[PDB]
A paper describes a structure:
To address this problem, we present a combined co-crystallization and peptide-soaking approach to obtain crystals for any 14-3-3σ–peptide complex that may exhibit difficulties when crystallizing under our optimized ‘sigma’ conditions. The second step involves, after these 14-3-3σ–cJun-pS227 crystals are fully grown, displacement of the c-Jun peptide via addition of the desired peptide for the final structure at high concentration to the crystal drop and incubation for a period of time until full occupancy of the peptide is achieved. We have found useful criteria to be using the peptide at >95% purity and performing the soaking at 277 K with an incubation time of one week. To demonstrate the experimental reliability of the method, we considered this approach for peptides found in the PDB where co-crystal structures were published with isoforms of 14-3-3 other than the sigma isoform, since they were not able to crystallize under the standard ‘sigma’ conditions or any of the other hundreds of screening conditions tested. Not only does this significantly reduce the production time, but new 14-3-3–peptide structures that were previously not accessible with the 14-3-3σ isoform, despite screening hundreds of other different conditions, were now also able to be resolved. The new strategy that we present here has allowed the determination of several new structures of 14-3-3σ which had not previously been possible, illustrating the ease and success of the method. All models were determined to belong to the orthorhombic space group C2221 using Zanuda. In addition, the method retains the robust, stable, high-resolution and well diffracting features of crystals originally grown in the sigma screen.
The 14-3-3σ protein, which has multiple interacting partners with specific peptidic motifs, was used as a case study. We have observed this phenomenon first-hand with human 14-3-3σ, a protein which has several hundred known interacting partners in the cell. Furthermore, different isoforms of the 14-3-3 protein are function-specific. For example, the 14-3-3σ isoform (but not other isoforms) specifically targets p53 and is associated with tumour suppression, making it invaluable to determine crystal structures of the target peptide with the correct isoform.
Residue numbers in the entry:
A (entry chain P), D (entry chain P): 384 to 388
B (entry chain A), C (entry chain A): -4 to 71, 74 to 137, 139 to 231
């Protein structure tokens, strides 16, 4: 899954 | 509010205990109580607020995605009745409630009192984040929700570019999340990729100014930008 | 109760959805609603009840242990005020509330209607388990709480020995937990070790009667008995 | 940590 902070 | 009778410092102390206990709903309630005391938040306190609500809404979003997938499969299939939609709607409503709560704290009155770049950009990024979580489940004013996220992110970007170095962890994390916004929400994968790459490259060129500890802080978030670029290209 | 207007079958359906979403508080509320419909529970439904509350109370116990350790260190140290004790007490009260809720469902009226060995032993084991969780935090009627756990476990043991084969997973799991009760709660490690060993050995001798699938079910719990024996000897 | 069911 793509990263967010 | 139920925290109105507790000292601000006690609320902060208990928020930190709740984090250690992985009791993030308690942590969020404590930090909500601290915000409602009306004083500005320190760097550490802003982090506690962010950690608390990110974990709470993260559980809700993960649950919503599980239920949404089940619901979508149900509409591909035996009729199981209204229960899947009902329960997805229950989780969705609770999620929207948490986002509205965070956005309410930012609007009353965290953002308007935040004058330093580190506080103002942090709060505006958070505003973009929680409108983005609203956008993830929106199916009706969806365009206005999306534009609210975009506008908050854009104001944060403009301030961070003028007031912060390219390696600043808040600036980096803002760019990471606005890039995800472009990719996932705004149907602009090229903008998402351009933003992540330019952010990474400009941070790379500024690392030489940093101490060892700041270098570690900045490179950690740069790695997340690279991870997304690898996933998307 | 808030679930009074929902169909029993819908409550069970949503409990299963909540499990998939890892929303165990919702799962427990749904199964509480199903129990309160007043009909007996099937094997699968009893499992859903157990899974829901075990996960809810498991989060609370883990948090309580974190906070209790911090509190104990605080009394070894700078005075930090009442906040650590207050917050441990808050988590403890919520935990006791969940145990009281489960014990209330068992007493009104699950146990008295349970006539088959598999249902009766299951419910009595659960009664022992939730009195045991009460005993873990008890510091005052502590002896009566401990004896309530012991008595529930003992009645379950007596029925399971008479009505179930030694490999029955409910009998095995009851013995595992009563052994932990002896070790952790009753200050009887020798009884704990004797029970785990005799349970393991008698199950070993009965495995030859089982299908491949039952063998897998039984050996999984036997491995937990062996794990505890290894830890304790 | 010791096992329970
Ligand atoms: Cl529902
Ligand atoms: Cl408290
Ligand atoms: Mg004060
Ligand atoms: Mg909705
Ligand atoms: Mg292209
Ligand atoms: Mg009915
Ligand atoms: Mg107490
Ligand atoms: Mg001895």
């Amino acid at each position: 899954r793509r990263a967010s902070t | 509010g139920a925290m109105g009778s507790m000292e601000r410092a006690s609320l902060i102390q208990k928020a930190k205990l709740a984090e250690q206990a992985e009791r993030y709903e308690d942590m969020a309630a404590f930090m909500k109580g601290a915000v409602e005391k009306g004083e500005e938040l320190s760097c550490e306190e802003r982090n506690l607020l962010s950690v608390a609500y990110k974990n709470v809404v993260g559980g809700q979003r993960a649950a919503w995605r599980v239920l949404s997938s089940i619901e979508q499969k149900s509409n591909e299939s035996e009729e199981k009745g209204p229960e899947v939609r009902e329960y997805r709607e229950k989780v969705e409503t609770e999620l929207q409630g948490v986002c509205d709560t965070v956005l309410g704290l930012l609007d009353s009155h965290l953002i308007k009192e935040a004058g330093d770049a580190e506080s103002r950009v942090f709060y505006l990024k958070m505003k973009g984040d929680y409108y983005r979580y609203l956008a993830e489940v929106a199916t009706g004013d969806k365009k206005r929700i999306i534009d609210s996220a975009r506008s908050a992110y854009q104001e944060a970007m403009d301030i961070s570019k003028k007031e912060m170095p390219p390696t600043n962890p808040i600036r980096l994390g803002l760019a990471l999340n606005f890039s995800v916004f472009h990719y996932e929400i705004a149907n602009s994968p090229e903008e998402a990729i351009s933003l992540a790459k330019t952010t990474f490259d400009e941070a790379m060129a500024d690392l030489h100014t940093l101490s060892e500890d700041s270098y570690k802080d900045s490179t950690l978030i740069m790695q997340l930008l690279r991870d997304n670029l690898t996933l998307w290209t």
